[model samples]
Structure formats: structure tokens, C-alpha cells
Target: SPSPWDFLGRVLQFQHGDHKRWWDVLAPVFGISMASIGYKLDVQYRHLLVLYDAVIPNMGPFPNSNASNITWTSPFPPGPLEASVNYQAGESSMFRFTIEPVGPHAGTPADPVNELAAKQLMQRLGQLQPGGVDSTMFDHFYPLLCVDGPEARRQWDSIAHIYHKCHTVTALDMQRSAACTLKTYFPPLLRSTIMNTSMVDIMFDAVESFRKQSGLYFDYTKIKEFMSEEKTHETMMVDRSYLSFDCLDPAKSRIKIYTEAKVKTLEEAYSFWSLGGRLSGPEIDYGFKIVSQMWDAIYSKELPGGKQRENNHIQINWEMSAKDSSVAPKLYLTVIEDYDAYVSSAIVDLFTGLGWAAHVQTHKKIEKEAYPMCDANPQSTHAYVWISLAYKKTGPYITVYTNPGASILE
Candidate 1:
């Protein structure tokens, strides 16, 4: 019988240098066991080392197990966890895990559902402030944390966790600003109005105000127009969203936003990015070609009932940070999981041609048996909660987020 860790084990198993070596450097640096924080260099962001045995249900991942027979029940506290392995041709393969700051046992008696993780993580980030990072960065983030919506009570739902892996700590933004992203969704959805004001309108104002104070440069006119066009309609309205910021350079920063809509959305969004003065014409086309192919491959196929594939289609994240603003930002597509093999095969076929073989093999492995399941209520369909595809000139990258709390809530 495989241990519960096998699921993550398979994900980390790759052709790169000993995964253990990286894990060793990262684990202690990341505090993988003691359930505390870790500092490798002078930098460390919000992190918690959770106990494996307690968090993962007793059900070990039954590889290629009959998902059809198994009943799925998304467990609470454990919430949802997502892991991603991204590889680039000339770079070391990247493996990242999205931790739920709200759920899982953080070995803290006071914070039952790990609710304190976000606040505490905020405090940890303050450590970087005097080192050079800006305090206003979190101010840019505060709007998304507590949504003062038409309904006041659901505010906590909007604020997700801090970016656990600290990938945003690159040479580009590390000095000036820090950024965190999704599912305490960085682009937190706005399902209700705020003081009778359009949420989209407010976000536009927020971006402008923040930009003025921070000296960040971004022209949101086109994005604003596209969002305005759709946000007024019924299907396009509600579930409105906004993401955290990426302060890339002196005059330029990024605001990543996504809304759940079946529009001319992708087309309009593509145009918004393509027309940007920064990108090479060809790379933008290349990214669009990849996204278009991916779109058709996933949506063309159907499910048992008339469950629209788009329904599982969460939202596409535009305004992702590229190699600064010089390169076109990778357009991101996010989808809630539906364990469809054909869809993954289509993804493999496309990316394998355009991407590194090492990446292709790993993606294929997960498609076969995505995650470990516990015999306890931790059962899963291997259908991830939110799977995201980010497309760039380098090709398309895949990220899968599995929330044990999701399926049950479904």
C-alpha cells in the first residue's frame, strides 16, 4: 500500500536533479515537518509545514482506481490543495504547491481551520519591508481580502492565501514589491455589488488610484471596455473578479483579473493584450494559436449530460506577468476539473510538440492517476478543483489545483 504522500511523490518524481535534493533544500527552508516557517536565503514568504498523516485522509491514492465506482466526498479543513510542475526548455523544472491558508492542521490550537494563516503570513511579509519591499503592496491587496459587497457576510471567501512558493520573488519585482495569487483566488470573484456601485467600476478606480500612488504604469482602457461590455449582461454579470498586483518596474505594474463568462471574452482579451505596445507581434500570435488549439480540444468534446464544458471553465486570467512588460504576458485559462482523459490527451499532444519532452512525460503521468486518495472520507475522482493553463511564446504550461474541500462542496 502506498503512503498518502505517494500522490505528491509522483508529481515531484521527474528527470530533474534528485527531487530530494531540491526537496531537502526546500523542506527545511520551507519547514516541511515542524509546522513552522523556513528561511533559505534572506527571503521567505508566508509558509506552513503541515503534518502529512493528519491532513491527508487514510485513503492512499489508488492509482488508476475505478473513479466510476468510488463516491466522492470533499473533506473540510483539509480544504483544497493544488500542485503544479512547470518546465521550460533551458531552465530547471519548477514544482509548486498551492497551500490553503484556511484549512489543514497548522499545529495551532487557536486557529482551528488555519484561519490565522493569512494574517500571520501578512505579518511574515512585513519582515521584507525594511529590506526594500513596499508596504503599499498589501494596500493594493486589501480590497480583494475583504469584499464589501451587496452581501457583507461572505467577505472572508474573497481573500485566499499568500503566494506560498514565493515565485514572485524574482529579480524583477523582489526589490520593489511582493505579489501573491489565486483560489483565495488572487483574482477574487465579485458576485455582488458594493454600495450600489459596479464592482468592475471600483476595480478600475482602485487600479488607477494605486497606480498613481505607486507610479505603476498600465493602460486599462481596453480591458476596462471589454469588462464593461460583458459585466452588464446577466450571464456575464456577477461572479465578477479581481487579482493581486505585480509591481514589475518603476512605471509599470500588473493587475490580473478574471470574470466567469462565455463571451467574445477570450477574443477581446487577446486583442487587449496583442495591441499592447510591448509585445512582439509574432509571440502574441503564437500564444493565441496555442490557446485556441487548447480551447477547441477541451470544449469540443462533451460530457455524459449537457453539462457545458464551459461550466467547468472557471475563468481566464489575463495580465499575467511576462518577462517584465517587454514580453507579452502569458494568457491564463482556469477551469474546475472534470476527469476527462481525452481532454488531457489533447493537452499532451499539443504541448509535447511545443514544449519540453520532460514536461510532456510528467503531464501524461498525472493524467493517468492524478492524486492520492485516502480510504477515509478523502476519496476523490482525481478531478482537480481548479486546473489552469498558462500560454506563452515558450508554449503552454499546466497547473492543477485539487481541493479536498471542493468535491464535497460540489
Candidate 2:
């Protein structure tokens, strides 16, 4: 008898439209075990004399008609095989079954049916030669997509081993690898962290502030109180070093631009710009004004006039670099290129001003109608503001800016 590996290779070619090409490409993506199993199955036991043991999870007692879906091309009638599902075992219920004689020379028992199918299948394949395989043997197997008996176990072992290897390279592993590489290869002075707790809290605060101004907001300060009550000391003490800042180039920092699709004309550019103007209203403008005042209060000497000037509709770019490796470099840029569209529409609900439905509709519309007219086709942009705290710590950085522009990258 051929091994499960060879049998699976043949089975892979049978599944997909591109045949072996898709099988080859997909094996790398889904991994061999997952792609082989294809669908989820809790358990399926082979012949046990007159009885078979199957356990399905979650859905409780299996439906009586579930066996109707279990079809085979063999001459035997289906209902002769009886099924009984038990849900008394909680989440994992046992389903026991056996076959009985129906009429005439008596129906083949479930175990005998499975055994005969297996025997015929192996014979049709000449034990290992598929070219000599009979169509009837293939028909008998029909839609039951998995191999069975000892062959199934052999194939499953290989699948389990491959999956085990895939699990070794996790997201944390990749993040740590990248962090260590940056720390080792790049100067400590050039390194900076993004996505710290401070940043997350600030971004959340910004969104919360606007939500409050909308008069349809939740109390975030109170929310934090609830969180503290629910959290345990042990849970709070868990190391967050893994969530520490990521390395990014200060010069590469710019307002992130997004498009529903491509933009090739001035009209398309305007549509993109329009969304930005609408999303950042008087609330965001006020938010920036307060931030500038706060910055002025703390670092009054840094500005030329000894204090930061407030501008309701303005853009600001601040960049600072450390003289020694003891400190990390910093960059801050903000832009308010569009005026606030004060029109209150239910269609514009979320923080970005564009409602979920409106955003999706606009994205789809621009993809079809607005992508062919402008130079830089993507000439328009949105704004964001982000700030990183002291480097190398497992903390937070917050950046909020509005306005789209070209990204500075190596």
C-alpha cells in the first residue's frame, strides 16, 4: 500500500480548479495538514464491529438527517445504517451508530460496508497503481474527502508535525527579531519607538473628546475606573515589553494617505480632500489648539517667540534630533489643509466624520468614477497626528494629524 504522503499529493491535485498548480501554491500558505483536512471535523472513528463512535462539538445532539448528507455510490440503501447522538456529555456529545439488515438477503452492516469499500478502493488502485483504478471504486468513495484506516493515521502524523513547525515562528518572534536587528544594525541614536501606551491613550482620548463633543459619547474617564475594578493585580503585572515601540524613520513620517481606489484627476483629488475636511471638524481644530497651548506651556523656550502660537486652521511640523546615543530622535508634523465642513449629517457619524456606510459607499464610488482624472491621480490626502514617548520603554506614543502628502522613504 502507498503511504499517505503520496496519496495526499494525488488528492491535492483532485481539489482546486488549477489542479496541481494551486495545490503547490496553496500548500505553502495553508500548510499541508490544514489544506489536506480542508474542513473542520471534531472526530470520526472507523469500524468498531457493529458500532461507530463519533463526537461532534458545540452543536449538541447531532440532527437525525445529518446522515442523509453522508452518501456513498455503493448499491446499499442509506437508512439501513442507524445513528444515535447523545448530548448528555455537555459540549462534547457522543454519537454512536451501527448498521442493521433491511430487506431481502439482508443489508450490509456499517463495518462491513466500510471494509468492502476500502478493499475495492485498494484493488482498483492496484494497491499502488492508480492508472488501473476502476471508476466504480472512485464512485463508491464519492464525496467523503478523507483517507481512512492506517493510511489516514500515517498522513495525519505528517500534517501534525508540519503544523507544529509553523507555530514556532509567531508574531512576537517576528517583532523581536526585527527589534533586535534594528538595535544591532542601526545606531541607538537613530532608533525610535512607535505605538507605545501613551500614544494609544492619546489617540483614544482624541477620539473620545470628539465623541463627547458630539453629545453622543461615553465617559472614558469612568470607563477606565471600570477597567481598574475588573482587572487583577497579576493581570496588570504582565510584561508589556512585547508591545514596546517599533523603529521608524522620522523623515519617513508624513500624513498617511488612503484612497478607495486610484485617483487620476482634479475631480477625484477634490473628493478625497472633501472627506478629510468633513472628518476633522471644529472639535479636532479645538483639540489641536489646546495641544499647541499645552506644548507652549511645557517647552516655552523652544519656540522663537518664547511661546507657541495657536492657529485654528493650520499645519505645524516639528523635528528634533538627539546629539548623543543617550536620547532618541523625534519628529512631529501636523496639517489642517481643509476647512471644517460643519454640515451635520447622520451619514457622517464616526470620528473621521465619515459614517461607516458613507465611507464604504465613497470608497466604492471613487474606485469606479473618481480614479481617472487627476495628476498624481492620488493628489489628495488625509491627516493624522502621532507622538512617541522616551525610547526603548514599553509605553505608548500618540500621533494625530490630518492632511495627505507624499511619504519620505529611503
**TM-score for each prediction?**
0.58, 0.15
Off by over 4 Å in 2: 1-348, 351-410
Q: lDDT (0-100) at residue 291 of candidate 2?
A: 42
Per-candidate clash tally: 14, 31
- lDDT for every model? 0.40, 0.22
User: Quick one: best lDDT, which candidate?
Assistant: 1
Q: Candidate 1: misplaced stretches above 4 Å? A: 1-78, 103-117, 124-135, 143-192, 230-238, 246-254, 263-280, 304-314, 320-337, 365-381, 385-387, 393-410
In lDDT terms, how accurate is model 1?
0.40
> Which one wins on TM-score?
1
- Per-residue lDDT tens digits for candidate 1, residues 283-303, read 666666766776666556655
Question: Per-residue CA lDDT of candidate 2, range 81-135, in tens?
Answer: 2121211111222222222111111112332112233233224223333333233
